Every structure is written in structure tokens, then in C-alpha cells.
Amino acid sequence: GKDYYQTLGLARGASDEEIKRAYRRQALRYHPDKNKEPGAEEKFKEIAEAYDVLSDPRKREIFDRYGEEVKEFLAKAKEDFLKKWESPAQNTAHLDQFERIKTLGTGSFGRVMLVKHKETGNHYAMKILDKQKVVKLKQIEHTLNEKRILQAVNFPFLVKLEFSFKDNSNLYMVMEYVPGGEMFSHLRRIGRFSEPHARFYAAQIVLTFEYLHSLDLIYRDLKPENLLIDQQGYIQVTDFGFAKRVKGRTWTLCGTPEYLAPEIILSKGYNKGVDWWALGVLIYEMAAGYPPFFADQPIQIYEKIVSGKVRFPSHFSSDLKDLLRNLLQVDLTKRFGNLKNGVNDIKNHKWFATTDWIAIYQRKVEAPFIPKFKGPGDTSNFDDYEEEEIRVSINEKCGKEFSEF
Amino acid sequence: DQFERIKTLGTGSFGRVMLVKHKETGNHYAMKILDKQKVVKLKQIEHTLNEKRILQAVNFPFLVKLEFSFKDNSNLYMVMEYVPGGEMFSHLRRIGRFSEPHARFYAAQIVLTFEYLHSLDLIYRDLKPENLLIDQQGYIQVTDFGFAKRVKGRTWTLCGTPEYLAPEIILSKGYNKGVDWWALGVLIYEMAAGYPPFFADQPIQIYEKIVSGKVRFPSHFSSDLKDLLRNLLQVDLTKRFGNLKNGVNDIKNHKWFATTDWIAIYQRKVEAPFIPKFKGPGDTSNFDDYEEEEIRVSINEKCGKEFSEF
Amino acid sequence: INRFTRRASVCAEAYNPDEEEDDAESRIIHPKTDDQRNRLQEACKDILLFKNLDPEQMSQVLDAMFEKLVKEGEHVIDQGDDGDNFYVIDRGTFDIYVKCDGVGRCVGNYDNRGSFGELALMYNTPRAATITATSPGALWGLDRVTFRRIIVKNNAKKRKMY
Amino acid sequence: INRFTRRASVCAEAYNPDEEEDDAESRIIHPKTDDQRNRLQEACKDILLFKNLDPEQMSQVLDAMFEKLVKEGEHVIDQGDDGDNFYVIDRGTFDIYVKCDGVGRCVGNYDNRGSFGELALMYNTPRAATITATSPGALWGLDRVTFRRIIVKNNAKKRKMYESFIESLPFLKSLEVSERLKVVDVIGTKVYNDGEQIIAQGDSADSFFIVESGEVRITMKRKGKSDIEENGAVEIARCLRGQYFGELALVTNKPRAASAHAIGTVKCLAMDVQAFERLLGPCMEIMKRNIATYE
């Protein structure tokens, strides 16, 4: 991470000009004879290592090659993303193919159900949406993002969505199957994870956050329901229509109504760092044992959010307490995510004493406890729901408004 | 069916209550339907029989009249005098909390009705804020008396509500008066703190709090009743200082309670500290906007031989 | 300000052991092995009802017990009918699916650990939730009628004699 | 174990920032008296949204406020229907009834305070309350459409007005298009009257500030610099709505230049190097890249 050229300020040819100035600055900053707090020793050691390696290209050649490879990979990823954005896709789906079985869960946006293919025959999930509720609210901008997100997928975490199908008054989107269940149900059943499980969850959260930030794609939506556990022993995210990348600011408030930071409640801008805050309170549910807001009226929730005060029962960890105490001001200006790379202060923190993202990059680490897989159609882990068929008349209702799909 | 109905007045586990107009005189009255469905599905004939036997020869200012009672081939309708005004819980929730005189008057009325019930050997049993009616003249009335008993004796009945119990009722232990006193210690709390007494998302926490007697001193509470609340919760009853059999020589000699002129209160003369605002016959501003459910009359005889005492 | 839940009554059968019924000393003991009783006592010696009880009553309750073999996939209890039984967590995974407003949701799976069903013995209440058996097992079917009758009879006899 | 809760999707109205055309100043006009305006301002100050708003937006909302006269026994707003209005009880008392499993339980009323349907403006949601008339009265407020439009217009004006005033400075080459928004958001606002010294003399000048509105005459004590002995108005660098000062303070490291002086009502920003040192770090290493200019 720490480039040897940027540590002391040198171009391609590290000469004996600014090296002395950098060494003097480093010595004036870090001083073992005067300073003794933790964290400074590692920084001083890294600075000394960079200084001694800058004088010998034999040790900086590997770092230069790694940086060049990282830059080439980033450029290739950006080119692929641009090509996918500039490449449309449609007319690759049909209704007479997948037959529904039962309902899995409906909400204020869509209904996920179980379907089976008529050709091969395999259980899968299908999200159905009705344009009747979207026409009244007018949310075509959020739905248009899915047309491009369907193709913008080049990572394991990114669920490779299937081809969608728009009807006269209904839309269907097939996705992968999740024999396991959701994390919210497991948390409500247990209510208190151990140390290994919490560490694994934090590592997965950091990994998915880094993956989402690499593409500069605002997550926007965030809730416990957006976290499914697959039978392979991993975590997956759902509902990506809310994602969007705009040069300017935005104002579409929709996603975290309860876990809303005090910076957006006043109808103001925000950045991707808020995604951590809205999720930080979630960690409380996996530490204390009860919900964060012990009230029912939105006024009490807003007063508790604006009032910088969080309890600390005799059940939290050592580093988690410090992490929660560091973030308490109203105007979160010293955020740990709003940095250059955004993967230094969080990884170097005491909470992540031992981590290894390379092992998870290739997907080869068995989860602590994988849900029981009782063969295909093992919908016992997921929550049940009443059956509700599609009772809509076959009639066109504004087709031009739903052309791009 | 010699009564013209107007609009429903209430629906719940206790039953249904509507408003009727006397055809022989023209006056708004309340009509409570026994239904008997839940009674046969839950067995509640003993409580009704006890209430009937009690009301057969019981009359006091803190009681509702029994004017005309009607039994059909499969239903029963009890008529009573309507008291426009509404319950005090609605006003308490709308405002927030009352003052010290209000709590003093409430405690005075509570001890008065307790003494009246003890004079003839009776037990109130159930006690909730949804059983009070304030008229315009200040005459307070109590409703819902099915949860009672003729003679105290020594039984092992289990009823009431989870929000008003004590360890003596969880494992029946007679509780000739603890159920009517221990739980009362929390009632004042409902009319003191700015939030309900019990606030938990599971009955286990409520049971643990009821078993572990400990009042949480609110952030804003008067120091006068603090000492009283710190001791209202107890196991036995003989250790309680203010708990004489008379019940008048203990509350009057208290710290805050001293100028409680019970002579003028028991005679129904002193006006209430908060009189409801009237408007017309059968007001509805104080009551909720509840709607009327599906009503059904009798068809044939199904359980008419139940209350075979009239 | 708040949803304000209802406050329905919790009345039940007024068991007056004095001149009811005709039989007497109807204990109906059902002995079993010693290992099962020893394993069940570890969990029975921690409930609020048994935390303060005479040893004789605890021994009688431990002796009186009926077993029921439940296979995989059997809706023996469903949210709707009245509830009169106390099921003890003996062995096997059992999912508690509650019909939250007509929607099934897992409350807390029990696997030879914990304790539930005691609420049914507190008062007349319908079924708590659906107990789905994921695999075969042997549960304890303790009815409500038996528990209050001796538990009150012993106290009455002790108060009459002692 | 727990009562639990639903996880329903929430919604808010959208907007097109590219649409800059709007009303001239306000559609509804109804200037009330002074006492009523003061009472409305005092009642609105208790709201959290009005804690950071400036007097300009408050006056705009007061001028665009809409008054509605409600008589006795009148009924317009009802539960279930999509909420599309908002009012405030200026006087009187009106009890609000909310549904509770088929029972319209009461919640309370207000008396020259409160705000019926204050949350409806934060997001589109069905009517979660029910109002009822009691006596003749007047309610002040504004619908959700116009309120959201005015809020978004003010936000866009505050976001776009500030930046164009720094792009002209040739010094600005390191900041990217994404950091400009963060810098504009971090910039605050402060007001200084006449005589109020912005900063005492002899302080460690190691920051940068730009004047927003109001001329600022920088002066110092005539002593070291060869000039008139009698102290007075030194011709250092009069800053105005366009000029800049404080840039030459990271590499030069010259002695105390001078001290500013706010003449009358002067509005300035509130930048800080701490916020800039979080991402790009100290500007000393960033400004060294463009050495061809300073050399």
C-alpha cells in the first residue's frame, strides 16, 4: 500500500536530495525517546524500511512491478465496466419457460417466489413486480439501473442476475437459488454471535464494501434482508436496483429510514461512507442482545439518533468499544472510510489483528457453520408466506415508459 | 328487543357494548351483550353467577344500576345507565401525567371502594384504568365487575392481566388482598412516569420484573412519594406499616396524605379536578373512533338453560 | 406514540379442590429409566416453578411423565386451537414457526437445550406456535390437567395438617 | 422472545436537478401580522429542521406559508388516503385519532405548537393519523410538493453558488471533480460585525480562508516595516467578493504579514486544514508538484 516513492517524495530516480529531508521529517515526527504510544513503532519501522529500500532498486523493483500490475488491472476493470455500460441488452427471455410453485416473500417493492424450469428442471428464485405501484410513485430511474447491473457483474460476490422479462403489467427477474436462509432470521434466533463468527462477518462486510467501492457504485439500499446465506457457505446481496453512479449529488431518500445518520435527516447530501454508519448500529444487535432503538414512535428514534449516546453493557469486546466511542459526534467529519484508499485505518485497526483477503478472493475457506441442505427444495430455513397468484388482466399500460429493459 | 340501538360503544374480550334509546322514556343507555360464545369456549359461567349473586343485594355509589335485564333463547343483554365522559386513560395518554392532587384523589377513591367492598366481604379482583367513568357532576363510576367473589374464603382463582400480578397469584397463595394491593403499587406508576410501567418485548421480562420487586426511580419524580414507592412492593403484608384492618387510620396519617377530607368525598359533593367537556346527547369527542362490527340477533335455542336462576 | 396492545383477561377453570370430582389420590405415576430422569432433572432444577418447590412435588412431577414418539413431518400442534399441553425439550431439532399476523417465521429452534411451553401452564392460552419436527424423536406430553391438581392438593393438605 | 417488527420499504419523492427553472420567488402570498409571524417563528424554532436553517429560508417559508380556515364539524383529511398536505395548529385544540387494530385511539392535541403530519414531508407514506374539527380556527403550513421544491431549490443554490468562485484561481489543479463537492460541503459560514477582530495578532498563520461577502481591510502595526511611525490603515491587501488571501502560507513561511478586520456585517467561510489532511494529507507535498509556476 505505502508506495516507496511517496514515502519520501521522489520521482523515477531516487537521488540524495529529498531523502535527507524526508529522513529528518520522519525523525522529528516519530521519536522513541519521546514517543511511546502504540502504533507509532510500526509506522516508524515502515518508514525506515521504505527509506532503506529507496536507496536500492533491487528491493523497490518488486513494489514497482506490483504497482504496475495493480494499475493495469484497475484500467482493465474500468474498460470492461465502460464497455458493459455502453452495451445494451434485451429480447432474451420468455414467460412460457419457468413455472411458479409457491411464494417465498412479498414486500413494498416486489415478491420473491420459487420457480422451476420446464426444460431441464431446477429450483430457482424469481422476483415479480407490478407496475401499478410504480406508476403512482414514478421510479423508473431506479429500475433502469438494473438493466445495466444485469451485465455489470465480474466478481464472485456480485450475483449474476438472469435475463428479465417485462409483460403488459408485470415484470419478472430470475436469480440464483438460495437453499440456506437470511442472516436476520439467524440473528433473531440466536441474538449473540461468538468471536470467530463476528470476525468472519466483519471480514465479509469489509470485503463486500471494498468490492462495491472499487467500482464506485453507491449501494444506496441497506437492510438486514439484503444478506442471504447460500448453501456453499458464503454471503450474497440482493436488491441492486437502488444502485446508481452519478457525477453530481443526489436527493432520492430511500433505503435506510430507521438507520439514517443525522446528516441526511435534514435533507442534505451524503457520501458512500454513510453505508458504514447505517450498518454500524447493526453490529449492536450482534453484541448486546436487543434492538438498538427501544421505542416505537419515529420521534424517539430520531431523538436517540441525534443524541450522541450509546450504552456499553458488560458484553462488548475491547476494540469494538473503542471503535464505537470514536464515532459519536453528530457531524461525522473524521470518518475512517473517507480516505485515499479507504483500506488502511480499518485494516490496521486492533480489531482486525489477523486477516487474509487473498484466501477469500478465490473462495476456498469453509464457513463456521453452513445451513443444513436437505436436498433440493429445502425451503425450511426461509420464512413461510401465504400463497398469492398473479390476478391481473392482460392489458397494456404505458409501454413506451418501459421500453429499456 | 324493546330497545332501539344507535351505535356501538365497545368491543373486547369482556364482550360487546352498544348504545340504546329507551322506547318507554327516551334516554341513552348502555346495553352489554353476553354473547356466551367465549363463555362456552372458555368456561366463564362461575364468574357471571358470582356477579349476579353479588348484585342481587349490593348497592353503593361506586356501582352501576341494574334496571331491566333481558335473556333470550341464546343471548343475554344487560341494560345500564350511560355516563358520557369517557375513560381517564385516554386523557392521561393525551396529556401525559397528572399532578399530586389527582393521585391523592385516586388513592382516596381506591381506599374508599376497598373499604366499601370489605364491609360486605367482597373482592374487586380485576383492576385496570379502562374501568372508570367521569360524569359532569363529578360522580365517578366503575364498570366491569364480573371478576369478583361472593365470600373471600380461600380459593385458587387465576385471572386478571399479566401487567397486574404478583408472585402470590402466579402460584396461587390465597392473596386475599395482596393482588388488590401489591399490583396497586404499580398503578400509581402508570399515572406518574412519562411512559408505561412495564415496557418489554417479551413476557419473560415482565414476569421477572414482577417477581423481583424493585421500582426504578424516574428521572423526574417527587421526593414525597419516593419513600412510599420504595416500600410499596413487598412479599408479606403484616410487615407493612400502613396496612391496618380499618384502612382509614393508616392512609390519613401519612406524610403527603393528610388533608384528604374523606367526609366530603364519600358523600359525593366535592367536584372532580377534571370535568369532561360536554356538547350534546351522547358525546364522542372523548371516546375513540371505533367502528361497529357485524351484529347478529338470535335464531333458535342453543344454550338457554345456562343461567337457570330467573 | 405507541401501538398500545390489548389487555385481554386471562381467566381459566377455577380449580377448587374441596368437593369437586369423586376420585381421590389420582396420581397415575408413570415410571421410566433412571438415566432419562437424571438427565431431565438437570433442566427441571432451574425453572421458576421448580426453583421454589417442595422436593416431594418435584419428585412426583419427575415420576409422572408420558412419552410420545414423533417422526419427521407431523403437524401435531398448530396456531389456532386451544392449548393444554406442556412439551419438554428432550432431544431432536424442533423448529418454532409462529404465524406472525398470518406469516410463518422461525422464533427459536430447540435442540436438546432450553425450555419452553411453560406459559401454557400459566393460564388458558392458545397454541404458542407451530412445532415442526425436523427429525424423529421422543417428546414429553404433559397435560395441563395433572399439574395444578396435585400441586394444589399437596399445599392444601400441608396447610390443613401443618 | 421479542414482539418484532416489519421491514417495509420506505419512499421519498424524486427530483430533476437539471431543471433550474422555477417560480420567481413564491407562489402563495399571505403576509400576516408581526405577532403571528413571531409566534410561528418561535414555534418552528423548536423543530430540529429549523436548527440549522438561516433567516433567509425562514423568511421565505413565512412569506410562502399558506393559511387555511377550518370551521366546526369540518372534515377533509382522512386516514388510508395518500397524505399530500401539511398544516400546523396555530391556535385552539384538536385531538388526533390514530388507528390501532380497527380502533381509532387518540394520541393528543396541540395548543399553539406541534405539527400535524410533520413526518409526511420527510417521505411519501399513507395517512397515519386522523384530524377532527372542534371550533373555528386557522392552520398555517405548506403542502409537500411546494415544500420539497423550495428545499431542493435552496439546496441546489447553496451547492452551485459556492464553487465557481474558486475555479478561477490557477492554484486549484490538485483537486479532482469528486473532491470539490466534499470541499464545498466542509466549508461553513460565519458572520462578523464591526470591531470584532477575526484573529489576534502574533498568531500562527497556517490555514487558508476566502471572503464571501463584505470588504475586509487587512492592517498591521507599523513597526518593523519601513513606513510611517503613526499606526493606521496599512495597504496590505483589501479582500472583496472575488479576491483571495492566505495561499502564500505553506512554503514561504514569512513573518507575520498582517491581521484582517471585519468592517460591519461581513460573511466569511470557515475552512480548516484538518479536514483536508484526512485524504490528500498536508498540502505542502501536493503544492510541490506544480513547481514550474512558483519555482
Numbering used by the authors:
A (entry chain A): 1 to 405
B (entry chain B): 96 to 405
C (entry chain D): 104 to 265
D (entry chain C): 104 to 398
Quoted from the paper:
The mutant is translated as a stable protein where the J-domain (residues 1 to 69) of DnaJB1 is fused to the cAMP-dependent protein kinase (PKA) catalytic (Cα or C) subunit (PKAc) (residues 15 to 336). In its resting physiological state, PKA exists as an inactive holoenzyme, which is composed of 2 C subunits and 1 R subunit dimer. All 4 R subunit isoforms share a similar domain organization which consists of an N-terminal Dimerization/Docking (D/D) domain followed by an intrinsically disordered linker that connects to 2 tandem cyclic nucleotide binding (CNB) domains. To provide mechanistic insight into the functional consequences of the DnaJB1-PKAc fusion protein that might allow us to better understand how it is a driver of FL-HCC, we used single-particle cryo-electron microscopy (cryo-EM) to determine a structure of the RIIβ holoenzyme formed with J-C. This is the first cryo-EM structure of any PKA holoenzyme and also confirms the differences between the compact RIIβ holoenzyme and the more extended RIIα holoenzyme that was shown by negative staining EM.
We then further masked the core regions and focused on local areas for refinement. After continued classification and refinement, we were able to visualize 1 side of the J-domain and CNB-B domain together with clear density for the B/C/N-helix. The overall structure reveals distinct density for 1 complete RIIβ:J-C protomer, especially the contiguous B/C/N-helix (B-helix, C-helix, and N-helix), the CNB-B domain, and the J-domain (top). In this protomer, the J-domain and CNB-B domain are in close proximity. In contrast, the J-domain and CNB-B domain as well as the A-helix in the J-C subunit remain unresolved in the other protomer (bottom). This asymmetry could be an essential mechanistic feature of the RIIβ holoenzyme. By using cryo-EM 3D reconstruction, we are able to observe this state that could represent an important event in PKA activation. The J-domain presumably can stabilize the CNB-B domains either through spatial steric effects or direct interactions that are driven by the close proximity. This close communication between the J-domain and the CNB-B domain is captured in one of the protomers in our cryo-EM structure. The other feature that is revealed by the cryo-EM structure is that the A-helix in 1 J-C subunit is also missing, suggesting that the J-domain influences not only the CNB-B domain but also the A-helix that it is directly fused to β-strand 1 in the N-lobe. Our MD simulation data clearly indicated that the J-domain can stabilize the CNB-B domains, while the cryo-EM structure revealed how the J-domain and the CNB-B domain interact and together control the A-helix.
